[PDB]
Design a protein around this nucleic acid. Structure first.
Length: 460
RNA sequence: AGGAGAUGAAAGUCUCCAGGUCUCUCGUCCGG
RNA sequence: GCCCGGACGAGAGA
């Protein structure tokens, strides 16, 4: 995250971009029944709740880059992770346009419901206008691709979500980086085969959790991290604190898999437009690009290997087991390591690592206090080899208070019941009861705790 | 400001639209 | 009924 250049769009022959300002979120019929502090993020400087300058708060996350270079440990990390991935036997060959657009085994189709990016967003062109899902006609898309070529600027948008109260006045809204459909397709065509293999193989070989079902995967994890010390921690602004050298690393891994290692320099050194400002950034993974999840994850796997090599002199990398989902990571070693000491080593690279789940200091962890993807671990009372993914009840209460689709609070409630019941019968009982304390809740179908339970057992 | 539409003979007026890459899960529907 | 395939929505997570 180093801003290199910053210009007015007109002085580069670029349009301004309409940036949305209204939230889709609104209070649900349960707004008053459950406790919660969260509210929609700030989307404009004219938000009354805002107690600071919005732009200065938005772009404050771009600091600079620490002075570091590659080194032998990073090169060892690359060598080791590269060796792992090769065992998967990934085809480095490109994929056909048809697969880039409509998907293939382990690659979803393009999202026809989201923006097409620059320049279509300034010309009233939607993805659906370029792609006819029902006839698979892509004549219009082919025409656009030729017309505007590639490496178009990503467009900065504000993410419309609930945030904690303390992110509202502070104006700490998360930003999104919109990839042009031209570029998404391009990255898919080159890297599709890699993305797919990752999607189809969550676990300790990909070093990646993307593509897992927590309800069934949670029982595999203690088998995959067979180790003695199990550990986890937190990144302060992971994506923007990625130094260009991790990108050189990622490239080296890609190269060892016989993929193209240069396209990703469009992520390291990226073009963006925010409203009427054109800018370019050196460093940081532009969350919103093609492959954010995979590339962020692959990178984490290098970092963690490097950090451990830095902190400990005689390590067995084969017994350092890692699973990552972007910035989120859980890992193990065969003996006990000092999380505190490892986190320290990230500092010289520009990484800020903190005790997992907002502790004040680093404490030991086991499958009792550790979490991944917001979920905890706890064994079934009947089958001790089956592990529940626990979910924070506070977040369930915050979630139910808001809705983006009033006419389907039923679907909403069902999604939460499937999260909640893993926490146990009596909390689930209480949840049901609170729901039915009002008329709207009693109108709703709610799955019985035992129905949920047995359905869970049948998946094993 | 751009796009789409409504209105008007026109001049004009009016209304709507815009928000990433993904994973899993649930609901509904059509299928083999 | 199970398995998979599509479509339309939603919720959570990164």
């Amino acid at each position: 995250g180093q801003i290199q250049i910053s210009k007015h769009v007109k002085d580069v022959g670029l349009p301004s971009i309409h940036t949305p300002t209204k939230t889709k979120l609104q209070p649900s019929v349960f707004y008053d029944i459950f406790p919660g502090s969260k509210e929609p993020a700030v989307l404009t400087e004219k938000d009354p709740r805002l107690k600071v300058d919005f732009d200065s708060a938005l772009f404050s996350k771009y600091k600079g880059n620490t002075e570091c270079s590659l080194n032998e440990h990073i090169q060892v990390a690359v060598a080791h992770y590269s060796a792992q991935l090769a065992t998967l036997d990934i085809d480095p060959q490109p994929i056909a346009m048809e697969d880039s657009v409509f998907g293939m085994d382990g690659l979803e189709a393009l999202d026809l419901n989201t923006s097409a990016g620059y320049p279509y967003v300034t010309l009233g062109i939607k993805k659906k206008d370029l792609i006819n899902n029902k006839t698979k006609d892509i004549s219009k898309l082919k025409l656009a691709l030729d017309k505007y070529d590639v490496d178009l600027p990503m467009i900065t948008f504000l993410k419309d979500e609930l945030r904690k109260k303390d992110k509202i006045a502070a104006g700490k809204t998360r930003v999104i980086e919109a990839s042009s459909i031209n570029d998404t397709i391009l990255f898919r065509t080159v890297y599709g085969n890699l993305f797919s293999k990752f999607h189809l193989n969550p676990g300790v070989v990909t070093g990646c959790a993307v593509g897992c079902d927590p309800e069934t995967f949670w029982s595999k994890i203690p088998l995959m991290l067979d180790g003695d010390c199990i550990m986890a921690f937190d990144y302060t602004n992971y994506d923007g604190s990625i130094h260009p050298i991790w990108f050189k690393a990622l490239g080296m891994v890609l190269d060892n898999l016989s993929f193209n290692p240069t396209l990703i320099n469009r992520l390291c050194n990226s073009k963006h437009i925010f409203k009427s400002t054109y800018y370019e950034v050196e460093g940081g993974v532009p969350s919103g690009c093609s492959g954010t999840s995979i590339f962020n994850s692959m990178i984490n796997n290098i970092i963690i290997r490097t950090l451990v090599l830095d902190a400990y002199k005689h390590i067995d990398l084969d017994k350092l087991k890692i699973i990552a989902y972007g910035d989120d990571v859980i890992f193990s070693y065969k003996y006990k390591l000092d999380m505190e000491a490892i986190a320290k080593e990230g500092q010289k690279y520009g990484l800020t690592i903190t005790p997992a789940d907002k502790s004040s200091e680093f404490k030991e962890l086991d499958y009792g206090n550790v979490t991944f993807l917001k979920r905890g671990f706890r064994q079934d009372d009947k089958y001790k080899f089956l592990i529940h993914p626990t979910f924070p009840v506070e977040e369930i209460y915050e979630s139910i208070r808001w809705t983006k689709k009033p006419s389907q609070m039923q679907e909403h409630v069902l999604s939460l019941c499937h999260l909640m019941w893993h926490n146990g019968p009596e909390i689930y009982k209480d949840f049901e009861t609170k729901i039915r304390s009002v008329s709207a809740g009693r109108a709703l179908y709610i799955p019985p705790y035992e129905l949920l339970r047995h359905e869970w057992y049948e998946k094993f």
